[PDB]
Design a protein around this ligand. Sequence first.
Ligand SMILES: Nc1ncnc2c1ncn2[C@@H]1O[C@H](COP(=O)(O)OP(=O)(O)O)[C@@H](O)[C@H]1O
Ligand SMILES: Nc1ncnc2c1ncn2[C@@H]1O[C@H](COP(=O)(O)OP(=O)(O)O)[C@@H](O)[C@H]1O
Ligand SMILES: Nc1ncnc2c1ncn2[C@@H]1O[C@H](COP(=O)(O)OP(=O)(O)O)[C@@H](O)[C@H]1O
Ligand SMILES: Nc1ncnc2c1ncn2[C@@H]1O[C@H](COP(=O)(O)OP(=O)(O)O)[C@@H](O)[C@H]1O
Ligand SMILES: Nc1ncnc2c1ncn2[C@@H]1O[C@H](COP(=O)(O)OP(=O)(O)O)[C@@H](O)[C@H]1O
Ligand SMILES: Nc1ncnc2c1ncn2[C@@H]1O[C@H](COP(=O)(O)OP(=O)(O)O)[C@@H](O)[C@H]1O
Lengths: 288, 288, 288, 288, 288, 288
Amino acid sequence: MIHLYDAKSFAKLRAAQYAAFHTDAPGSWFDHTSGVLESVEDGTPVLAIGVESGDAIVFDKNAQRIVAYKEKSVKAEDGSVSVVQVENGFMKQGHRGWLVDLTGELVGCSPVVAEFGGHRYASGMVIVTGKGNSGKTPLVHALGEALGGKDKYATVRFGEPLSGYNTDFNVFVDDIARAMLQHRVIVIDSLKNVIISRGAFDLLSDIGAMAASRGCVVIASLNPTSNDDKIVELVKEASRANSTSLVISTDVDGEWQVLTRTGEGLQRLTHTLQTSYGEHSVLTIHTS
Amino acid sequence: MIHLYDAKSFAKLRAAQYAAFHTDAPGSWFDHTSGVLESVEDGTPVLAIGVESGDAIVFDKNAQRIVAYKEKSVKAEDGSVSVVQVENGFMKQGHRGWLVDLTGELVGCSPVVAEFGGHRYASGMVIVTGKGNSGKTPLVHALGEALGGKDKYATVRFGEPLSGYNTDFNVFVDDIARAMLQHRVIVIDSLKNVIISRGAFDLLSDIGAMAASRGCVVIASLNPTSNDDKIVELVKEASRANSTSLVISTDVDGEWQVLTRTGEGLQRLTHTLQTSYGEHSVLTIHTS
Amino acid sequence: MIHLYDAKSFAKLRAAQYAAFHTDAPGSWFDHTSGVLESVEDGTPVLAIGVESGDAIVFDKNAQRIVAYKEKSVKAEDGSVSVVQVENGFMKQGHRGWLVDLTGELVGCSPVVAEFGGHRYASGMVIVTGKGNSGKTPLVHALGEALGGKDKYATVRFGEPLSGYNTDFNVFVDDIARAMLQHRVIVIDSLKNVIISRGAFDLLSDIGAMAASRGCVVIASLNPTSNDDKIVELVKEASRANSTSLVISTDVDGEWQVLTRTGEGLQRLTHTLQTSYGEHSVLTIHTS
Amino acid sequence: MIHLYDAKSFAKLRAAQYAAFHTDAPGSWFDHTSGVLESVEDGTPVLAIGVESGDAIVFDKNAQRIVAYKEKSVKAEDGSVSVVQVENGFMKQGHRGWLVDLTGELVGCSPVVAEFGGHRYASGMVIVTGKGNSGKTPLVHALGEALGGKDKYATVRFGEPLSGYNTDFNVFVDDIARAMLQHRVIVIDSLKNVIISRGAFDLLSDIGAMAASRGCVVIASLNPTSNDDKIVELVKEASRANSTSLVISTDVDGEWQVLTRTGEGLQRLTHTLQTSYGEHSVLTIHTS
Amino acid sequence: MIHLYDAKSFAKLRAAQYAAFHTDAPGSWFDHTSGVLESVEDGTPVLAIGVESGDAIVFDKNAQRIVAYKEKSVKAEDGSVSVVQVENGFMKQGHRGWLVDLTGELVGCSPVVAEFGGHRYASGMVIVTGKGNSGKTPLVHALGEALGGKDKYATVRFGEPLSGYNTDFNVFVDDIARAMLQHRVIVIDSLKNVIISRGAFDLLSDIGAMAASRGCVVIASLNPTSNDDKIVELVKEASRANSTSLVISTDVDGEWQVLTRTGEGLQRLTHTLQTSYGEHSVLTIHTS
Amino acid sequence: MIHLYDAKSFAKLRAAQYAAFHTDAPGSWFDHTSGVLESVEDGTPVLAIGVESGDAIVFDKNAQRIVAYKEKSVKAEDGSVSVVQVENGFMKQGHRGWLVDLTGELVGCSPVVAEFGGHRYASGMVIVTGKGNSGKTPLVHALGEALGGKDKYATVRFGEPLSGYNTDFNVFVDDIARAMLQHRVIVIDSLKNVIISRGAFDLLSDIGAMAASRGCVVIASLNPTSNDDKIVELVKEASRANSTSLVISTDVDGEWQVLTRTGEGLQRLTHTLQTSYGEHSVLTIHTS
Ligand SMILES: Nc1ncnc2c1ncn2[C@@H]1O[C@H](COP(=O)(O)OP(=O)(O)O)[C@@H](O)[C@H]1O
Ligand SMILES: Nc1ncnc2c1ncn2[C@@H]1O[C@H](COP(=O)(O)OP(=O)(O)O)[C@@H](O)[C@H]1O
Ligand SMILES: Nc1ncnc2c1ncn2[C@@H]1O[C@H](COP(=O)(O)OP(=O)(O)O)[C@@H](O)[C@H]1O
Ligand SMILES: Nc1ncnc2c1ncn2[C@@H]1O[C@H](COP(=O)(O)OP(=O)(O)O)[C@@H](O)[C@H]1O
Ligand SMILES: Nc1ncnc2c1ncn2[C@@H]1O[C@H](COP(=O)(O)OP(=O)(O)O)[C@@H](O)[C@H]1O
Ligand SMILES: Nc1ncnc2c1ncn2[C@@H]1O[C@H](COP(=O)(O)OP(=O)(O)O)[C@@H](O)[C@H]1O
């Protein structure tokens, strides 16, 4: 919705956004929105995501696709009316993104998803990219495990010439929808065949906000298919713009730089990761 | 409509346009158009705005969607006939923009929206842009609060990877329509995913004129998602031409330049803002 | 239609075209075509102009849209047949442009619209363009007044972020159609949003010939929205080719160069205008 | 159709093609095909030409449009079957170009159209182009008169901002069809709005062969809208490729170079024209 | 279909392919496929070729169009099923190319079409190209006659501004289909208007393989319509890759280089032609 | 589906993927998936592949197209549901790729297809490319034979101007589907006409993953149709990204570099091949 502010309510918002990253218990926002989703009436659409054509598919709170849903309207505090209809497996009335309100007045946050090695990490979309042919896949998995902490992370596989990899964009969006509905830490390998269809452009435009709203983290690899030239800089720019955090390779073997947007209008933080390989190319992120 | 002039009536027009910015009570045009809108007959379409596909959705004076409306025609002084018809929630006959006459003969104005720190600010569209990939969000909010003055400003959030941000263009235009119908000071964060769809092109083509007609100000952030190259100058040019006022970052920390189009054919004014951050990245614009 | 010539009739043609600019009473062609238009039978389509989609809307002599018109064919001297049919507000059969013969055998003219400051000015399209992003609006209005002479000039406003400006292309074509049907001197501010839709391309392609056929002058501003680079040269080139006269800014403050096509195959003339501002940015063109 | 050759029949063909340019009485081919056209059964389609959309309109021998024509097939010496159907004003079955056989075995000619100043000129398409803003219109008219000789030439006017100029492509193709059906010497002013729609591309691809097959000459002006740079060379190349003869401006005031394709695989000839202006910009081509 | 090999059966294939060019009687494959075509059952579709839109038209063994044909399926050795259905004159089921099996296991050949001047020439597509805007037409005809030997060659004329030249792509493909169905040596003048429509892209993609399968040679002229720049090398590359043999002009008057692909994976051979003109630009290729 | 991991199960995954390349019996994965495919119930869709339009055709285990198949859904461990429906020969519901589970939980492998000359080779897609326009065809055939070992390799021929070569993309996908369903070692000559249609893009995007899932190797030639310029680097880049292994030509006569992706996140290996020609251009890869 739209929100109205004066100096006082704006200062309160910024303090709450700051708290959502710096002082809330890690993963608290994810559990909060899990509760919101569990409260949703049975059969109710909760999430719509674009398929390759630019039509949207719609899911309920248990990550089941909805194929038929009679028109239903809802009136927000704003005065804005949301209408949702599903017919023949596709959204006929509605919008892409969350179809129920997960955030309320608390918008523009990068809710803390996990804390690891003395650093807090934001929910939202994390693009792992930069110069190089190689090394992003082990990093996304190492980050997945580390941010998962006590919990397993979910892996979405797409568009690589390896066994068992889905290459159909419409199964990809089904996987991502389910992942965000059910898991706090999600890895996508990779965004190669994403980066262009209407659905693919919808995904890059939508996924960060969807994830940040849920309080889950989506950790996605992106190789520059192009040279190690300076189309690299173009890829970093596009990635930075459409992600909540950016992780980029560096000059130095095994080192990565993490750039975090801590919230709307808030400080952007940077820190470095040092990593090393063990057996079978399993990567460890050093902390101590 | 079209308007006829000779030397004498043109001189009168330019005097009236000059006054609309320089001597009218700040915010007085907004109050006038609120009065015009309030006196419209119940159910009358007042505003049409393009959705992503290039079709238009239509609102009444209370910012509620008009879904069905039988063809009605109105005869202007110009002799021209305007027609409005809404069917299945979409405009079938009519034009984008204001469907009631807010201006009459008084056109080509940048009606003063507010006065702050010894400077008058124009209604219409204000694009906050320039080199850098940060700093615009705190500025748009500071400007929103400052120009709001005694009133709250409305915030429209779109297309950033942060919690609660809508990323559906059709919701965006609903938000902006409601905002202009109901508030004098409006902030958009951001124009990233705007600037391209038919609806998105319609928006940059229409919003400045819509806001100037109402006497409201729309303050919109725009990062060069492209480089800090030049690129930057292309964005400045495009922004300047399609906005009423332009606010651009400079090589001095915290300093911004404001470039105001004071009306049709009138002087373009410049002044500089100095700013600083307090707690939680809340920006203050220095004044006296 | 097509016209046949030998050396003798071609010499007569060129003499007649020459006279249409150099020796006819200024504005006499306009007065002639006004009479032709006034004598047109009631309900007759007289003008077809492209709307945004590339379809065409049709007007009668009073500038009212024709919604329904049963097929009517007309046989030319050429043996060629013209047909007009209008259905559901759109041209079903016919061509863009004037649908009645305004002039007779005399074609390829730049009929003199007015004389001012020792110089004759052509009807047709006049594009006011060149380097800089400022100064064109006051010039088009000063020209409008000066060429209007004893008569008021009509102002068409389109696609600028100021109060009262239409930003819908289909209202634009309506305005231009009414203007050319009813007035000898017309100002368009501006061509920004035209220069691309099929309707917009049609407009650039059609308006000069329409205006020259009527004997009215359309004076249109065009900024290079792009840089003050060699994009200026390209805009100038494209403008010159699709206009009857070109007015371009120069190196010298307040000075403009006017380049006039005096008719088919005839001499192109050049002269300069000197100008200055008075109060409220009202520009005067110097003469004596 | 296809044609089979051995060394002997090929030598005979080349000798006949050579004769068609060098030794036949000027304009003889035009009179021959006029006879062929006059022999055509009443109501029979003889010519199809592309309209702007890429559909084709169809004419009979008297240059009247055909709107309804029941399917009719014809078997050529080749074994190839030609089918022609017209429905609702458009070709439903058939091909663009001549729908009756004007040429027989005598194909690949540039039949002599006229002789002037000690030079033979070919039928087909003659593009008058080259560096410069100006000067092509007087040249096309001077050539028209000169090649017309005893006969008047036909003028097709299209797409210039001057009085009486058609700007609708579909009337343009109607004019050109009629001109080629009825006249040996045809001038088009200009190809500006041609050079892109399917119909426009069809015209450039078709018109030379259509004209050469008839034995008529189409003399068309083409300005480079672009600079006097070296997009000029690109325009010359495209023109040369799609015309039977090319006339290009030179370094020297009033001088033009004529480049003639004398037939299939035959010598290309060059000569120069010297010209001067009289009153009202009437151009004379010097001979003696 | 697909074919299985081991070392022994692959060696046999390469021997057979080598023989198809180097030791088979010249023109013997053509005679064989004529026999295959003659033994097809009456009414059987034998060839499908794409028309401009990308649909396909279908011919029988006598090069007559098949307009309606009930679905029929055939079981290959491969286990694969081919199906053919024609409805309203267009292929509804099937594939472009030969609809009967002309080759069996003997695939990847450049069957020798003729021997002339001590050199064997391959069937398939031969593109005659290179720098210059003249000389290709006389060469293609000289090569047609020379390779025709005891037989006449067939000439397909397309897309040049000369008398009797078809310029409709759909007639072009009918001409080429008939030519390949009925003659061993075929000349196309020219490929200008080919090289872009779906049908045109289909043609360059298909014709070489179609001709090589038949054992006929298609000799096609191609000018760089683009510059004599480099450009030229792009055309050479594109031509080489999509033809069986390439013939290119050189810096020596009258000299051409022939580059022959002798079969799948086999050596590419080169030899040079010397040529001279006689009367009426008839070119002779020097031999002994 | 999506898969969940913690540190322990991820370590097991990487160990299993490592084993799939380094220690599994060469060709064992293929033999496994053959058994899965053979045990599939009669009529079950097993493979969907995109045709030229971007629709998908569906095959059963015997490589026969499925024309009609009533909706059938299957529930995964993931909770996700897969559905297949085929109507009028096209997939109505489902995804591109394998429609049955060939492998189980083990994904992200490059299953060893064969061992030759002291080196293990991965299944999946192998693109043979690099500088030069010659030499790739003999290499793909030599690899096919060598990796075939005791078994024959299947050859898919597409889009070259030689006898018997299919040039219809839809037959191509049929051939590739049959090949992957029935053979462990597959050669495609070539990708020229693939590298763009939606089907062609689907193919590049899908085939590596399809082949790796099956445990078959597809060995595909690709010339840079463009120059031996830095376009080579771009082709190499695009090829590497969409292939499991890359084989590229070098500076040295007969020498090729093989670059193998051994599995998800695993080491990429490099080794060189030395080669020489025997009779009829049969290439041998040296070993001892
Ligand atoms: N033990 C190791 N030492 C060094 N590099 C390794 C090791 N294991 C894997 N790699 C590299 O890391 C990459 C693994 O990630 P991969 O998915 O192949 O590429 P990306 O991560 O860029 O998508 C491989 O390209 C490989 O070259
Ligand atoms: N206290 C602070 N001091 C200096 N810079 C800050 C501070 N807080 C935030 N910023 C900067 O201001 C930006 C906030 O606006 P943001 O939305 O991130 O970018 P933009 O405003 O350009 O869209 C951040 O990029 C951050 O780097
Ligand atoms: N009194 C003045 N002195 C100098 N410049 C002026 C004066 N009044 C207006 N201008 C300039 O002339 C322009 C008026 O025309 P405008 O419509 O703003 O641009 P354009 O004419 O290029 O469309 C303004 O940009 C302003 O900078
Ligand atoms: N008497 C003259 N002396 C010199 N130049 C002339 C004379 N008359 C006309 N011209 C030039 O010739 C041109 C006439 O042709 P025009 O149609 O205007 O351009 P184009 O022929 O290139 O289409 C004019 O541009 C004008 O500048
Ligand atoms: N007798 C001749 N001597 C030299 N050149 C000739 C002779 N006859 C024709 N030519 C050249 O050969 C060309 C004939 O082929 P043409 O169709 O015009 O071009 P292309 O063959 O490249 O399509 C002409 O351009 C002409 O310049
Ligand atoms: N015996 C040989 N010696 C040297 N080069 C050869 C020999 N046989 C064939 N070649 C070259 O190898 C190529 C065979 O592969 P081909 O299919 O023609 O090209 P590509 O393999 O690049 O698709 C030919 O271009 C030819 O020039």
